JSON list of C-alpha atoms and ligand atoms in Angstrom, two decimals:
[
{"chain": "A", "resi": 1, "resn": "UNK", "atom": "CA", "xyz": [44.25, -27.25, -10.35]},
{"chain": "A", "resi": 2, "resn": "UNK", "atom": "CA", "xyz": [45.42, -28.31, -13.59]},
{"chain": "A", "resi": 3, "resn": "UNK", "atom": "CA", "xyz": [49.51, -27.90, -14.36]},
{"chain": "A", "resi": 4, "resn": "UNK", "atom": "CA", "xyz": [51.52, -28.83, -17.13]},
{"chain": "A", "resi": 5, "resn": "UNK", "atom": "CA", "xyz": [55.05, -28.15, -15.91]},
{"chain": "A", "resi": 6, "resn": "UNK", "atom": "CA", "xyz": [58.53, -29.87, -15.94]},
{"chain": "A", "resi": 7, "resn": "UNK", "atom": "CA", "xyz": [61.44, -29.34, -14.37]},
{"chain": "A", "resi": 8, "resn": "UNK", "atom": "CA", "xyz": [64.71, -29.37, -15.77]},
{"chain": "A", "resi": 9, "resn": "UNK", "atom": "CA", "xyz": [68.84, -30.02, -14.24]},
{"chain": "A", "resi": 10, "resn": "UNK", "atom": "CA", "xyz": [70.45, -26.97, -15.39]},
{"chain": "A", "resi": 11, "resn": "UNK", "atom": "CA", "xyz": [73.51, -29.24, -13.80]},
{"chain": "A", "resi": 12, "resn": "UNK", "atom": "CA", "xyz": [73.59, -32.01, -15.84]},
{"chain": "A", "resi": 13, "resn": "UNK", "atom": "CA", "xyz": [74.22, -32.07, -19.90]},
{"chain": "A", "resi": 14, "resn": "UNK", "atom": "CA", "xyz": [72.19, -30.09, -21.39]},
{"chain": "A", "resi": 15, "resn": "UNK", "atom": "CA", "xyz": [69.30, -29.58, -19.20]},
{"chain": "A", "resi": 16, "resn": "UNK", "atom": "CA", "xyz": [67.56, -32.64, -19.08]},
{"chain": "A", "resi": 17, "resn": "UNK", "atom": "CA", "xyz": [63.83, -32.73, -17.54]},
{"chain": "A", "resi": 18, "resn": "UNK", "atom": "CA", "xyz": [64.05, -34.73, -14.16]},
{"chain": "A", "resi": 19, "resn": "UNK", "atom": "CA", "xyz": [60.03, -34.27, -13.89]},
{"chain": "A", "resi": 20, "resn": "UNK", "atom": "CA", "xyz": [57.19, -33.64, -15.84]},
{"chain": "A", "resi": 21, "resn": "UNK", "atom": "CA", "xyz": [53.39, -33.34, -14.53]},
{"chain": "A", "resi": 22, "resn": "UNK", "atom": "CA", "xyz": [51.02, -35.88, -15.89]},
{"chain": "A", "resi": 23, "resn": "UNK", "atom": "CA", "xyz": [49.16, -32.85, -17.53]},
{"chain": "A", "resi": 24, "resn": "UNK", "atom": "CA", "xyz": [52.53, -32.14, -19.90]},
{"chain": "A", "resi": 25, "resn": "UNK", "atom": "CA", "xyz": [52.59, -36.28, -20.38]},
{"chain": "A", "resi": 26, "resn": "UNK", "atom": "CA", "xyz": [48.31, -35.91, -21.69]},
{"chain": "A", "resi": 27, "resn": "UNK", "atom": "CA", "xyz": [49.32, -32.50, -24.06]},
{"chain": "A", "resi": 28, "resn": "UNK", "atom": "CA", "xyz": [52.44, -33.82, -25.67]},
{"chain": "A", "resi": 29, "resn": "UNK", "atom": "CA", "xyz": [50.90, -37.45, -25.86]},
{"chain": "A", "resi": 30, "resn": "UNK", "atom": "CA", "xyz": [54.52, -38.74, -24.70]},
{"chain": "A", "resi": 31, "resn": "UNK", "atom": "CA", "xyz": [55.18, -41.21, -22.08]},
{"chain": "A", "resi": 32, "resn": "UNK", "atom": "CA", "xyz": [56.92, -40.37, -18.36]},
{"chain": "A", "resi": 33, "resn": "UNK", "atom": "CA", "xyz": [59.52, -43.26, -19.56]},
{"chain": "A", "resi": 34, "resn": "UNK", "atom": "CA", "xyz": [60.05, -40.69, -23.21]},
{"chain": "A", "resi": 35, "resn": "UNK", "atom": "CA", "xyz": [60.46, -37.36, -21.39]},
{"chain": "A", "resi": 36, "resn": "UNK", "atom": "CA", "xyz": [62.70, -37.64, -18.15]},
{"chain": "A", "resi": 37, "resn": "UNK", "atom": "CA", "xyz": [66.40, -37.02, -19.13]},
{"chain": "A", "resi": 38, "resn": "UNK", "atom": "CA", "xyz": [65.41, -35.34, -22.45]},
{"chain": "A", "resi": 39, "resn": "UNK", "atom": "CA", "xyz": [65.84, -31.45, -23.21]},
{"chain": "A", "resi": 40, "resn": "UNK", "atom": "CA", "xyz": [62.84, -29.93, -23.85]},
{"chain": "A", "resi": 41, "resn": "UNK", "atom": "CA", "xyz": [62.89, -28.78, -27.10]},
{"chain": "A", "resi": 42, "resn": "UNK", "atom": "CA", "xyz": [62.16, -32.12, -28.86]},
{"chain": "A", "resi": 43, "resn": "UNK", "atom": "CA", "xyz": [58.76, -30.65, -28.51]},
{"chain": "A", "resi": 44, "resn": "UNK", "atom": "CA", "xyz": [59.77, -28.01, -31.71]},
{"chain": "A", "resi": 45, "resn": "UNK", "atom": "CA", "xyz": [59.57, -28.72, -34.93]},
{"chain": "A", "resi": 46, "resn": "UNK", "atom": "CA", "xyz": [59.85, -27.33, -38.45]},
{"chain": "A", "resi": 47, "resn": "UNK", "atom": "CA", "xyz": [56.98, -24.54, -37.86]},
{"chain": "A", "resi": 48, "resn": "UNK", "atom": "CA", "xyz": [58.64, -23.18, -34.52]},
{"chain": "A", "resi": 49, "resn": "UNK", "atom": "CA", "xyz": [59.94, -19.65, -34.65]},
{"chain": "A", "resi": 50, "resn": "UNK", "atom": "CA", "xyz": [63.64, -20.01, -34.22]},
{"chain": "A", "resi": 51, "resn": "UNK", "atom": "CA", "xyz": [63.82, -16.30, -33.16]},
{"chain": "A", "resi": 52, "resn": "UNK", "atom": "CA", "xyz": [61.90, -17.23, -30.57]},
{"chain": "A", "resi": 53, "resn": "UNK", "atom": "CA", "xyz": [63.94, -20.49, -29.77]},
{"chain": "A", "resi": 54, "resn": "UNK", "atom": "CA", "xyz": [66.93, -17.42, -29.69]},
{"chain": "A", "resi": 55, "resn": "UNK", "atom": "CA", "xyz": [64.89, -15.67, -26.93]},
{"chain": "A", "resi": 56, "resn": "UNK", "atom": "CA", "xyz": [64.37, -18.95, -24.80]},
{"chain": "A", "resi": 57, "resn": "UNK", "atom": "CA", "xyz": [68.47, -19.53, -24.98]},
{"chain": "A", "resi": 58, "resn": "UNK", "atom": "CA", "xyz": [69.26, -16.37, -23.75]},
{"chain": "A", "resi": 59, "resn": "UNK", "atom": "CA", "xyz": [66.51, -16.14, -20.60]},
{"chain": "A", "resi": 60, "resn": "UNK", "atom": "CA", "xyz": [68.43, -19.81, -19.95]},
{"chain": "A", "resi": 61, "resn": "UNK", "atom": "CA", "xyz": [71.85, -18.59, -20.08]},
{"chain": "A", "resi": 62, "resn": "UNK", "atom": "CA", "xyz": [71.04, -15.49, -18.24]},
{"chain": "A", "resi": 63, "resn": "UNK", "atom": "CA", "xyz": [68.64, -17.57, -15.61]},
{"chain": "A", "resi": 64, "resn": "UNK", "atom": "CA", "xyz": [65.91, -14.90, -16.69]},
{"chain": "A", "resi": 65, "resn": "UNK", "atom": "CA", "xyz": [62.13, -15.68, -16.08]},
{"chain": "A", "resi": 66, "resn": "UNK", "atom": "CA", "xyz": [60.58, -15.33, -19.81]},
{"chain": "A", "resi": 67, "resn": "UNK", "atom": "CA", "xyz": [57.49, -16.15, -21.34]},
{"chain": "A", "resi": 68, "resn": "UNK", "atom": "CA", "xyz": [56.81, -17.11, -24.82]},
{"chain": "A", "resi": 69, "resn": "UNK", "atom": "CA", "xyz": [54.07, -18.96, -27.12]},
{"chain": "A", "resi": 70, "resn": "UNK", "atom": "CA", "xyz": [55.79, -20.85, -29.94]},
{"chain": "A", "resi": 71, "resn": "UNK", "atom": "CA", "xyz": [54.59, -23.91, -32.17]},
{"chain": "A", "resi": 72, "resn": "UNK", "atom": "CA", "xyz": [55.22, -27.35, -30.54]},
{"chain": "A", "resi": 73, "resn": "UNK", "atom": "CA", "xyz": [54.57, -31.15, -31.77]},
{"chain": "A", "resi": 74, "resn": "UNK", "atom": "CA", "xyz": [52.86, -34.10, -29.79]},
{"chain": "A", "resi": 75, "resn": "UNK", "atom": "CA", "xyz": [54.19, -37.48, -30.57]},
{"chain": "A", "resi": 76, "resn": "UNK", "atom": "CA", "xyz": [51.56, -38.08, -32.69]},
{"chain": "A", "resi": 77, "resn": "UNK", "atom": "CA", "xyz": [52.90, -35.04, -35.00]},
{"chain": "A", "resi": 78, "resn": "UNK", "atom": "CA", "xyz": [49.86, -32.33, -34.04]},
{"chain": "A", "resi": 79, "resn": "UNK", "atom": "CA", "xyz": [50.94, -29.22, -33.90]},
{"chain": "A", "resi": 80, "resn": "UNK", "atom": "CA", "xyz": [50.02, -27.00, -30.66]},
{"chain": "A", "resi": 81, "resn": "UNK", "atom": "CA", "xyz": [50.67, -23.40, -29.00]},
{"chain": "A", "resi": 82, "resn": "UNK", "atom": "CA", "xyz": [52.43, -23.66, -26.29]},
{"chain": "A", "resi": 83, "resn": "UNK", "atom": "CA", "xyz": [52.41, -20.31, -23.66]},
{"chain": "A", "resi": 84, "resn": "UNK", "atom": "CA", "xyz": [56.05, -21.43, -21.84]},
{"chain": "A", "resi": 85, "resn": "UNK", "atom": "CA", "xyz": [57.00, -19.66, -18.85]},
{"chain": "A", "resi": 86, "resn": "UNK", "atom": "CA", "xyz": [60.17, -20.61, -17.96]},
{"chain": "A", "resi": 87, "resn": "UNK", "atom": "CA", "xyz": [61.06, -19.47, -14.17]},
{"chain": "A", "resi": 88, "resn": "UNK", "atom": "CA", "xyz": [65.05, -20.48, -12.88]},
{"chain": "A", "resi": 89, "resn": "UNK", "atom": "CA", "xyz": [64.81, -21.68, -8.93]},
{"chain": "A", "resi": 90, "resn": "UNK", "atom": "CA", "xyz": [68.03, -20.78, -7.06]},
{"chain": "A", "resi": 91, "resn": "UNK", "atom": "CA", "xyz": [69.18, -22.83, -3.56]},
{"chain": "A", "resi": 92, "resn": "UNK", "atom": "CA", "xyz": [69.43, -21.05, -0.03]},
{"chain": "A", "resi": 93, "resn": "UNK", "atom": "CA", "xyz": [72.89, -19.91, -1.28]},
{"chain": "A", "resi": 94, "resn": "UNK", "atom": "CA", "xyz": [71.60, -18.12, -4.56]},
{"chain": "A", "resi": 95, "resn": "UNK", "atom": "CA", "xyz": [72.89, -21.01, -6.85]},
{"chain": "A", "resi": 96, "resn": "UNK", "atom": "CA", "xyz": [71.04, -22.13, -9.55]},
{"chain": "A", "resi": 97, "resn": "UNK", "atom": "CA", "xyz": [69.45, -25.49, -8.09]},
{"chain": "A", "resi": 98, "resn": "UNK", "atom": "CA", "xyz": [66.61, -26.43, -11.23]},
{"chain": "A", "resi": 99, "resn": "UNK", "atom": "CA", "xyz": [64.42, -24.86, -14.08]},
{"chain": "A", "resi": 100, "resn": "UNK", "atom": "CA", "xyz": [60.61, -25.20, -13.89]},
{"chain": "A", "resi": 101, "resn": "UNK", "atom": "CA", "xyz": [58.66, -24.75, -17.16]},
{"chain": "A", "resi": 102, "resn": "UNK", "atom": "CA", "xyz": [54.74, -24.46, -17.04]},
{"chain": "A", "resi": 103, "resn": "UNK", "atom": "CA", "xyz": [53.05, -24.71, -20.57]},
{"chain": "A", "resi": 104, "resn": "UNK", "atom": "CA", "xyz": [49.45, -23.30, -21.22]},
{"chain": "A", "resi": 105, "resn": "UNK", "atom": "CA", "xyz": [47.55, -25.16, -24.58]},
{"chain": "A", "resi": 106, "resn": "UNK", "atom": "CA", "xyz": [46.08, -22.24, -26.93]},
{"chain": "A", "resi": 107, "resn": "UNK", "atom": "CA", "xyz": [47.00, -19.61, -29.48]},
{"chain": "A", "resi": 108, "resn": "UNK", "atom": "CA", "xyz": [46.68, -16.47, -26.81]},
{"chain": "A", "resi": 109, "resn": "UNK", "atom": "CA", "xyz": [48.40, -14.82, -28.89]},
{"chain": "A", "resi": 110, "resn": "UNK", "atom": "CA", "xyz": [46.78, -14.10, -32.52]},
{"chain": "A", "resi": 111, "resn": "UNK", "atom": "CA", "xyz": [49.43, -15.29, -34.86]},
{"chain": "A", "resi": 112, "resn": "UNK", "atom": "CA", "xyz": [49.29, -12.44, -37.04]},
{"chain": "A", "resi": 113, "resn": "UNK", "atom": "CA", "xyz": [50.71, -10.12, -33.90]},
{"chain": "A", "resi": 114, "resn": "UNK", "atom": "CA", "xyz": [53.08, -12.64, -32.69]},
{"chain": "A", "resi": 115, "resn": "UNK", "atom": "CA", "xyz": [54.38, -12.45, -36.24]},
{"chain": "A", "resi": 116, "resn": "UNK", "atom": "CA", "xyz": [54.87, -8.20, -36.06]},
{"chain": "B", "resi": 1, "resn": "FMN", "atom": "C1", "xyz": [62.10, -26.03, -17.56]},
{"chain": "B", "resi": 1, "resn": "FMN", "atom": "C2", "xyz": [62.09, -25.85, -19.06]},
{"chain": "B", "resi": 1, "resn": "FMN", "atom": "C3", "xyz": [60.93, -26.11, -19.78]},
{"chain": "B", "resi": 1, "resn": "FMN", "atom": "C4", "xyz": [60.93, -25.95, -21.16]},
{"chain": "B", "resi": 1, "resn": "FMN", "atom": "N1", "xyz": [59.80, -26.19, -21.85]},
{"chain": "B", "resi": 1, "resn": "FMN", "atom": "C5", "xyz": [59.79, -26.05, -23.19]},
{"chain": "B", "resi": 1, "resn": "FMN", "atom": "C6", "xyz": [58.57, -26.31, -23.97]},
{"chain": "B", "resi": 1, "resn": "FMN", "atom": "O1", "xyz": [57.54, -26.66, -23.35]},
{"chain": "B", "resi": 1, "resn": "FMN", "atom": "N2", "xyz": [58.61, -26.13, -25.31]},
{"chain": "B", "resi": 1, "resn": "FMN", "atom": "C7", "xyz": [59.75, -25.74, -25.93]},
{"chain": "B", "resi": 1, "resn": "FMN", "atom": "O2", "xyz": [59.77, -25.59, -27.18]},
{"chain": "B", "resi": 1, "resn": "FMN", "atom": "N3", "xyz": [60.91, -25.49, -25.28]},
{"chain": "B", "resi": 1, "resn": "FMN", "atom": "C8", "xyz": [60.98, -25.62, -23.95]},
{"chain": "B", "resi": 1, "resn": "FMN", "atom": "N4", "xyz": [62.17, -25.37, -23.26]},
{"chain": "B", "resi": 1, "resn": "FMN", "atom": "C9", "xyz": [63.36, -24.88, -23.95]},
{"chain": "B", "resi": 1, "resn": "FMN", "atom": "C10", "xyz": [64.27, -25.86, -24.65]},
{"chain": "B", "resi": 1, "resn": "FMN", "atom": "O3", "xyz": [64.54, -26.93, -23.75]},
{"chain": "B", "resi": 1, "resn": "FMN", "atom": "C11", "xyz": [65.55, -25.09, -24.99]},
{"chain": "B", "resi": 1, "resn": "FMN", "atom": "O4", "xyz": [66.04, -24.44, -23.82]},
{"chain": "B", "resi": 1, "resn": "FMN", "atom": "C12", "xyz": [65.31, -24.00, -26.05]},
{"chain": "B", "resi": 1, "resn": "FMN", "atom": "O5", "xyz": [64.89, -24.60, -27.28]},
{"chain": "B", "resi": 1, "resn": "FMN", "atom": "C13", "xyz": [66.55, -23.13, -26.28]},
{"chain": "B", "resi": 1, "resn": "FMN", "atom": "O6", "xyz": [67.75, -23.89, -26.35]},
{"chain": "B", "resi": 1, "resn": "FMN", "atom": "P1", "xyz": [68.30, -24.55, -27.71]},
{"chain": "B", "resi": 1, "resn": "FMN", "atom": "O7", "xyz": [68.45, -23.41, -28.69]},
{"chain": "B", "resi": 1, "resn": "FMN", "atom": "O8", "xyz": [69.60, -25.19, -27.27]},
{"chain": "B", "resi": 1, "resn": "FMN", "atom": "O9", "xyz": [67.25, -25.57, -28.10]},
{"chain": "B", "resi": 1, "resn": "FMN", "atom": "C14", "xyz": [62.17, -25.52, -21.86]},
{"chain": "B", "resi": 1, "resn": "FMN", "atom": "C15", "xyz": [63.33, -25.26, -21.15]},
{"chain": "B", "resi": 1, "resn": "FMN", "atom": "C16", "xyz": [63.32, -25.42, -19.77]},
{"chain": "B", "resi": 1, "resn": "FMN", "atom": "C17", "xyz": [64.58, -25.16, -19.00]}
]
């Protein structure tokens, strides 16, 4: 099966993705060698909803599940929707170990709803 996902260090700075599939590395256009130890969000760009930015924060800061389709950018500048699921994945003990993030490719979401 097909899965764009990467998986982010909630415990080191800033999140940084420690792996992403070779699926997110053919939708974003960017290299392995470009991605790992970045935060995510270099993927937004001037069209992405900063509200919904706002709702990704706070799913991270309260380790919530949350999905969301915002605007994202390929290397190459093309603009995409991006259906994120973020999911936090605790240890044995309950901690917070990682963050896995699986992106879908589409505008599921009719833009003139996701605007209401
Ligand atoms: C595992 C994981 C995957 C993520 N994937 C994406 C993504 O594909 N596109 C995106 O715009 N943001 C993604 N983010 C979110 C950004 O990295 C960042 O958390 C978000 O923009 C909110 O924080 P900020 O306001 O500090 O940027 C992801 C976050 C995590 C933890």
């Amino acid at each position: 099966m097909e899965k764009n996902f990467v998986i982010s260090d909630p415990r080191l700075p800033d999140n940084p993705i420690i792996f992403a599939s070779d699926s997110f590395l053919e939708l974003t256009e960017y290299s392995r060698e470009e991605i790992l130890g970045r935060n995510c969000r270099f993927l937004q760009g001037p069209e992405t909803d900063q509200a919904t930015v706002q709702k990704i924060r706070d799913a991270i800061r309260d380790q919530r599940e949350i999905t969301v389709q915002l605007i994202n950018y390929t290397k190459s500048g093309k603009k995409f929707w991006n259906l994120f699921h973020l999911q936090p994945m605790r240890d044995q003990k309950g901690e917070l170990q990682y963050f896995i993030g699986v992106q879908l490719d589409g505008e599921f979401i009719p833009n003139p709803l996701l605007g209401l």
